[PDB]
Amino acid sequence: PETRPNHTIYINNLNEKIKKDELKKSLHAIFSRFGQILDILVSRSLKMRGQAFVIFKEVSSATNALRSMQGFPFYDKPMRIQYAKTDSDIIAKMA
RNA sequence: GGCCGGCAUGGUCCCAGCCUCCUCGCUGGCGCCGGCUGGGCAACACCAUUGCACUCCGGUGGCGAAUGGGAC
Ligand SMILES: [Mg+2]
Ligand SMILES: [Mg+2]
Ligand SMILES: [Mg+2]
Ligand SMILES: [Mg+2]
Ligand SMILES: [Mg+2]
Ligand SMILES: [Mg+2]
Ligand SMILES: [Mg+2]
Ligand SMILES: [Mg+2]
Ligand SMILES: [Mg+2]
Ligand SMILES: [Mg+2]
Ligand SMILES: [Mg+2]
Ligand SMILES: [Mg+2]
Ligand SMILES: [Mg+2]
Ligand SMILES: [Mg+2]
Ligand SMILES: [Mg+2]
């Protein structure tokens, strides 16, 4: 359902027909305005398809991105967003 | 994509057309029928999947495809 605040947002219900490189770029296009993005992780494997991790440098960015883009129609599908359950390695490798 | 068999089929060159998972080719292929067989999921389609990762990594399918004109 939902979890504790995090630098990283977990996005799913994404259109699975879209390729990894395009998907990453399109996600930057709509999410960059919430704050600096450290990385976007995408895989098309059987387990990880339809999903993305957007890693913000500051948690407040993640928070605003989550509230604002919940259900945003993206490649004809309503985007579902939550905080990631765990910190991404890029975040742990800092603080 | 490869090989073989049967039948049909005069040769060389030119132009145009058509076909596609298999160099979309600046020279790849394209008579009819039938059997054997290779590679790969890179793209595409379909099936399955709503999945919390930081390790690339589900499956199946097609190629069971494609002809006119001219010069000598
Ligand atoms: Mg990209
Ligand atoms: Mg990458
Ligand atoms: Mg997967
Ligand atoms: Mg033969
Ligand atoms: Mg005869
Ligand atoms: Mg015959
Ligand atoms: Mg002869
Ligand atoms: Mg003649
Ligand atoms: Mg020609
Ligand atoms: Mg034409
Ligand atoms: Mg064609
Ligand atoms: Mg047979
Ligand atoms: Mg986790
Ligand atoms: Mg085959
Ligand atoms: Mg002729």
Numbering used by the authors: 4 to 98
What does the study report here?
The catalytic activity of the HDV ribozyme is essential for viral replication and viral particle assembly inside the host cells. In addition, residue C75 (C76 in the antigenomic ribozyme) is essential for the cleavage reaction, and mutating C75 to any other base, especially uracil or guanine, inhibits the reaction. In this study, we have used these new techniques to correct and improve the cleaved and the cis-acting C75U-inhibited structures of the HDV ribozyme, which were originally solved over a decade ago.
The 1CX0 crystal structure of the HDV ribozyme self-cleaved product was one of the earliest ribozyme structures ever solved, at 2.3Å resolution, with R = 24.6% and Rfree = 27.9% as calculated by PHENIX. Notably, it exploited the ability of U1A-RBD protein to form crystal contacts, thereby facilitating crystal growth, by removing part of the P4 stem-loop of the genomic HDV ribozyme and replacing it with a U1A hairpin. By using a combination of PHENIX refinement, ERRASER corrections and hand rebuilding in Coot and in KiNG, we made multiple changes to the model that improved its agreement with the experimental data and its MolProbity statistics. The pucker corrections were particularly impressive; hand refits and the use of RNABC were initially successful in correcting only one of these ribose puckers, PDB residue 152, refitting the C3′-endo pucker as C2′-endo, while the other seven ribose puckers were each corrected to C2′-endo pucker only by using ERRASER. A close look at the electron density near U23 led us to model a second alternate conformation for this residue (see Results) similar to that seen in the inhibited structures. This suggests that release of the metal ion from the active site indeed makes U23 more flexible, but the residue can still sample a conformation similar to structures when cleavage is inhibited. Occupancy refinement assigns alternate A and alternate B 0.64 and 0.36 occupancy, respectively. The rebuild for each of those structures (in independent ERRASER runs) resulted in a reverse G25:U20 wobble base pair: for 1CX0, small movements of U20 enabled the base-pair hydrogen bonds, whereas in 1VC7, G25 was flipped from anti to syn conformation (along with geometry and ribose pucker corrections). The clashscore is reduced to 0.75, placing the new structure in the 100th percentile for its resolution range. The final R = 19.85% and Rfree = 24.08%, improved by 4.75 and 3.82%, respectively.
